Amino acid sequence: KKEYTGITYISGPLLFVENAKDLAYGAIVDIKDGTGRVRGGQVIEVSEEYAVIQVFEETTGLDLATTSVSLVEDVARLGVSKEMLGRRFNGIGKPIDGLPPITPEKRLPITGLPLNPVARRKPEQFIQTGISTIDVMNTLVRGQKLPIFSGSGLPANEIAAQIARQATVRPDLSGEGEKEEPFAVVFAAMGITQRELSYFIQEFERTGALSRSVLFLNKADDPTIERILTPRMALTVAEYLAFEHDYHVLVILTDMTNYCEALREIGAAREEIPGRRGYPGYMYTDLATIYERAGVVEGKKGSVTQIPILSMPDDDRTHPIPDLTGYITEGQIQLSRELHRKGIYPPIDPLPSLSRLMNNGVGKGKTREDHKQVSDQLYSAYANGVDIRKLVAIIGEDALTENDRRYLQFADAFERFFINQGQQNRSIEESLQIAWALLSMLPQGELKRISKDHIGKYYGQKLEEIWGAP
Amino acid sequence: MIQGVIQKIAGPAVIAKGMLGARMYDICKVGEEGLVGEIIRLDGDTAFVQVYEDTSGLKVGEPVVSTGLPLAVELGPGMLNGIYDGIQRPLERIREKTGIYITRGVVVHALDREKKWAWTPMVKPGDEVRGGMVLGTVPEFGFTHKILVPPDVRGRVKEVKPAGEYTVEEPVVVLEDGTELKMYHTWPVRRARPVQRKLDPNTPFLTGMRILDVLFPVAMGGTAAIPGPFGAGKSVTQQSLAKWSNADVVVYVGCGERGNEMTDVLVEFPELTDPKTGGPLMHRTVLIANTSNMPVAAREASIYVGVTIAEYFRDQGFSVALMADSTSRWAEALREISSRLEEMPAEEGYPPYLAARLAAFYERAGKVITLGGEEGAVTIVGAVSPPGGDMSEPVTQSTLRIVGAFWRLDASLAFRRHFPAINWNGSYSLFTSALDPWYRENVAEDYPELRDAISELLQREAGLQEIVQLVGPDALQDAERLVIEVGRIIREDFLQQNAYHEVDAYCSMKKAYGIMKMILAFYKEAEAAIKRGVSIDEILQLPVLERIGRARYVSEEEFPAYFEEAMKEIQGAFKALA
Amino acid sequence: IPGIRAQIRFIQQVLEQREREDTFRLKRIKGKIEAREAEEE
Secondary structure, eight states: OOOBOOEEEEETTEEEEESOTTOOTTOEEEEEOTTOOEEEEEEEEEESSEEEEEESSOOTTOOTTTOEEEEEESSOEEEEOGGGTTEEEOSSSOBOSSSOOOOOSEEEESSOOOBOGGGBOOOOOEEBOSOHHHHTTSOEETTOBOOEEEOSSSOHHHHHHHHHHHOBOOTTTSTTOSOOSOEEEEEEEEEEOHHHHHHHHHHHHHTSGGGGEEEEEEETTSOHHHHHHHHHHHHHHHHHHHHHHOOEEEEEESOHHHHHHHHHHHHHHTTOOOOGGGSOTTHHHHHHHHHTSOBOBTTOOOEEEEEEEEEOTTSOTTSHHHHHHHHHSSEEEEBOHHHHHTTOSSOBOTTTOEESSGGGGOSTTTSOTTHHHHHHHHHHHHHHHHHHHHHHHHHOGGGSOHHHHHHHHHHHHIIIIIIOOTTOOOOHHHHHHHHHHHHTTSOTTSOOSSOHHHHHHHTTOOSOHHHHOO | OOEEEOOEEOBTTBBOOOOTTOOTTOEEEETTTTEEEEEEEEETTEEEEEESSOOTTOOTTOEEEEOSSOSEEEESTTOTTOEEOTTSOBHHHHHHHHTTBOOTTOOOOSSOSSOOBOOOOOOOTTOEEOTTOEEEEEEETTEEEEEEOOTTOOEEEEEEOOSSOBOSSSOOEEETTSOEEOSOEEEETTSOOOOSEEOOSOSEEOOSOHHHHHTSOEETTOEEEEEOOTTSOHHHHHHHHHHHSSOSEEEEEOOSBOSTTGGGTTTTHHHHOOOSSSSOGGGGEEEEOOBTTSOHHHHHHHHHHHHHHHHHHHHTTOEEEEEESOHHHHHHHHHHHHHHTTOOOOBTTBOTTHHHHHHHHHTTOEEEEOTTSOEEEEEEEEEEOOSSSOTTSHHHHHHHTTOSEEOOBOHHHHHTTOSSOBOTTTOEESOHHHHHHHHHHHTOTTHHHHHHHHHHHHHHHHTTHHHHHHHOSTTSOHHHHHHHHHHHHHHHHTSOOOSSSTTTTOOOHHHHHHHHHHHHHHHHHHHHHHHHTOOHHHHHTOTTHHHHSSGGGSOSSSHHHHHHHHHHHHHHHHHTTO | OHHHHHHHHHHHHHHHHHHHHHHHHHHHHHHHHHHHHHTTO
16 A cells, blocks of 8 residues: 655644645545554645645644555545444444444445435425424424524533434324334434433433434544534435435434534634634535535435524524524524523423424324414414513503403413423324413404314313323 | 646645636636636636535646636527526436436536527528627527527628528528527626617516506616515515516526525426416526525526526517526625635625625616617516615615615515515605606506505505504594595505406506596595595495405406496495585 | 614624734735745745
8 A cells, every 4th residue: 555654744733745646635544653553634735746634633643754644535435324223423434332333335425416406396294393382383394404593501402312212204194194104313413522422322222212313423522523524424324315215314413503613623724714703704605515405305205304403602693603504494493591491391482483384384184284373373372471471560460451361371371381391292183282272261262363163173172181191 | 728737726626737828717627527617816827726516536637628718608599498507507407417416527508409490591691790680580489589690790691591490509600701600609697798779767667566566666677676584475476576577588596595495486487387378487487596505606606697698688679577586695605705715805794896796787787779779678676685684784785776676575564464565665666757758658647646646645644653553543533534544445455466366466557547546536535525524434334445445356358447437436425425 | 772773883893893904914924824935935
């Protein structure tokens, strides 16, 4: 194997090597030093006189006399297989769960190709996450990109793990009748700590969710370039499964802010001049190359749904990261610090949340046909309840009209029975039941969004099940 | 012709080597895989190239070839019913070639080189020709596609090809000095195609929507701008404007849209739309689809490609309507391109030439006398979508200074079931005074005064709402009650329009004039009555109301009779008040 | 409300101005490192 000696420079993350015309741009190399310890590096610049290499590790043993550089691969690839389901990987594709490496059905470039616009089709069917404020009011449709806007201290890892081990597709509600479409979850974690890593492993092992999952876990002190490669490997596996084996895939990307920070550090390490607010000038197109490889294609039966989780840096929805993410994706689910400190889990605020494709995935043939109007009615009632709850502090309840006390009690029971669901796994029917039992508090005729048929059909139930059962 | 090697791959689409003959902003072929890129800086022997796709896998020593010509489009027969990307690449043939993905370095020609067209000459040997003159004819999806001399060509005919049936490449006319004219030519997308003279904005662009055509019109060759809030039904408005207007050809430009742009462009247009007269609407429109993760060069050039195609169809003698899906997503790509060249930002990061580029786009609109002596026009309707609806960003400010009309869609209206959800308070237009004569001569001698009167009623009813919020409607006087009621009647029987009703989908100018005149007459009568001593309650239950509010759904033929008899009925019910 | 909006737009102006200054400086130092690495080549 051809070895390249002739290092001329070592500083920080870079090192220059001479007489290296035969290294392709973007290639992956390895760096063997005087003690024989082998590191890894990527070629970020090549010309006639020398090549620049970014070492993704520390450089504390290197010298200009014993170091050598050798090629391992011309472009970054990933060996995929259908027997990855159940395995854990570190974020550049190496196993960390103590099992043998896999044998690939093929090797794929992790920086995949863009989808052709005339090949997609309109997303049509929904996914049951088991959480009522998401299913009923912000339904997730197969092929959508729905991000979760979290905070600094809010529990987004718990919500991620719960959605991961609860999600399913419901073929019986549609005409399909029988369960023959497979479901898979791909779980990419970026810059997590050891505490969170222990939590995730324990959660995926204690309930058998691992049997249908792939995990790409990337710790906080690992090389940053691995943090850059993690989501691309995840989405490569997802696209392969979906469009070669008809799987329905659900991809979760745990902290896109960690990704953006790594991207900024790398861009600065190559001496690029940044853009607005200090982030790279090309962050929009980068995030787009990640998010936009998701959807449903025409003539195929698989699908790729995507739920990027990110924590708004300073609770600021105008920071570049949530800003661009909102430009690209189709809605957002907004966690709230108030509901969190009030002891509610999961702390989802229905008022600033929104699913943009929801209307094309609900109704008869897809879900129960009262879904849309019940959603709108719950929204309006909760808004009125919140306003009245604010006014009753300066007026006092005795000076309120009757419908107002109705709305007050409604909003209270709403956030105590609908939102605060704990670790229960609610179907869609249980959620619609609870919604109707809550709407039954308001007087009939106040529900001016719903049509009369459904009001006759479902009104009148009272809170029975949520306290008659766990 | 010029050819070199690679000297340095500095990273993301940045190359160099010795190519002394090469010229600025030429299109080049990088590597062996043939990646395309544009030359941005010449130095000594070397030249800097900006590749479009990613360069991972390239190495130094590979060849670099320069085509010798800047970014260009192919203007000829075969573009209608077609779906292109931002640089005129046929997406359908790409798919048929390489599947559901777009592999890098794929090569396809915009015009199908194999299809045969039925040529029909219109010159004979010895004829002098200049730039822009007609040359022949080809039938295409139901209209004669003329064949035009390129705008910079001049000579005398030597020979013409007989009627027959040829391909696009066949040289159908050979000029004397030796140059051959094919069925198509090419044009740099960054140069405005020349014309004789620009005419004035004195003829209206008819949309078929009452509010846009009456309260805020645009002239032939004018420009408007609409914002893009969610839930306001922008797509339905755009489709109605596409299918009902008096434009012969439609060009739709979707630049940098969300992944789900098909859901309302590529699955809707081909089927869910039919013209007034025939089959598919797609037989007279050119789509330019461009999602978010396409290369930035394509997303930035999409606007210019679209406007050049529209200028072609105008120079041919039609009247074109061009719509930009989101110019904010285009300004984003512009900012990114600028940041790669390390320029100083002006405000909010945007380069200091944002306004110049925006004007260089919008100023190609207009009605002209073509080089061939015909008349044609291009009307632009471009959408702007700020971050959180703030009209103070630099893109919106730069736009509003050069457009002629602002149609303010608003979600709060579609929340209360008002369609189309155009806010009549924030909207405006600047073409009304210039358009008045055409109105007097083609609609009615008093049309402008009725339009101002309706505007004034709406203005008063708006300036009255706060006192209605404070106490409620029943607590007001008789005159204030009357103006509230007549304002509701206006904005529920004249402004509002149902795009799916097979009769209310369209409306003429005379139909709208009739409705306005009906309402003004009714209001004059009612004012006289309540001044006389009738209560507003006898008035609200008058039977003439359910006919003045039903006048939308009557056909365009049965409307003159309906109108005259409804006017007589309005006269009658007043006598019972007298 | 007008007073708060005034304060906000003022703060935003100052922040953008500082950002512009420091990007100017960054461009300068990059040009410098390239020049003085090439002159030593």
